[PDB]
Amino acid sequence: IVVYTDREVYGAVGSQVTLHCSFWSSEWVSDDISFTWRYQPEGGRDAISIFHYAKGQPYIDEVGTFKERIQWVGDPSWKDGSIVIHNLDYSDNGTFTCDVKNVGKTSQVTLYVFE
């Protein structure tokens, strides 16, 4: 029924930040759910997939902007699909969108890095 993320998140260069994603429903829902995370850099319009989870298996992208900087920290049993973005860089600014499916429901969070 509803997907949750933070509205904005601030991070320091060389530090890490966690991007929360979870979903809730008033009725029972099985653990056969998928989570997909997409990234759009500040001032761009393309949304690139950086992480995917389904049938109990996680898939991390090894080719893009956050390659070697993504950690899966969610739990499907708890309807949680959160990830951590590591070793922040100035150029990381942008909007991240979490897409939940059982067509999905999405929610976004914008990142700003300072220091």
Sites of contact with a copy of itself (CB under 8 A): 36, 38, 45-49, 52, 103, 106, 108
For residues 38, 39, 43, 46, the Cα torsion angle rounded to the nearest 10 degrees is -50
In angstroms, give the least distance from the CB of 37 to a copy of itself: 10
For residue 38 the two structure tokens come to 């997409």
For residue 16 the two structure tokens come to 């890490």
In angstroms, give the least distance from the CB of 36 to a copy of itself: 6
For residue 21 the two structure tokens come to 């994603």
In angstroms, give the least distance from the CB of 28 to a copy of itself: 27
Choice between 46 and 68, CB closer to a copy of itself:
46
Choice between 71 and 106, CB closer to a copy of itself:
106
Choice between 1 and 103, CB closer to a copy of itself:
103
CA distances from 93 to 49, 52, 90 (A): 16, 21, 7
Other residues' Cβ atoms within 10 Å of the Cβ of residue 46: 8
Choice between 38 and 79, CB closer to a copy of itself:
38
In angstroms, give the least distance from the CB of 27 to a copy of itself: 24
**12 close to 77: Cβ distance less than 8 angstroms:** no
